[PDB]
Amino acid sequence: TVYSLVTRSWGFRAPNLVVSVLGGSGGPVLQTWLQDLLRRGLVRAAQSTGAWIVTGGLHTGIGRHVGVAVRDHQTASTGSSKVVAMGVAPWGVVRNRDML
Amino acid sequence: AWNRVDIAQSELFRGDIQWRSFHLEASLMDALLNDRPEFVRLLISHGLSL
Fold first, then answer.
1. CA-based torsion, B40, B42, B45, B47: positive or negative
2. Hey, are the CB atoms on A29 and B47 less than 8 Å from each other?
3. A71 in a known ligand binding site
4. In which compartments does the protein localize (chain A)?
């Protein structure tokens, strides 16, 4: 029923590929070699094939560097289609869940 | 101030420096008082809120 929510009630197309990214040891700043790997390896692959990126949907850990990569790729590319980034996070660690 | 994007884009936004917000906002005020459309587009593109 969660997938039926995504493809019917919200309405997203089906993935041709699903890559789920893990990590988070180096805390605040990642090396730019790996930032080039995220921006020009993974985000333009998910732009080309049509794909999902499952990461933590927070501003901490890996999802910070992922969201920097997706926003930076939307700067320097005109393909007229967004990159479907989907984020999961536990309800307890949410900052401002009171407004929901 | 030198009106040279090709230095600032290619040496100061590679990702080595985690830039804070008011570091960008002061430079954007310098880019709005003078006439530099290219730096305005470059600084708004890095996730700033007006």
1. negative
2. no
3. yes
4. Cell membrane; Endoplasmic reticulum; Golgi apparatus
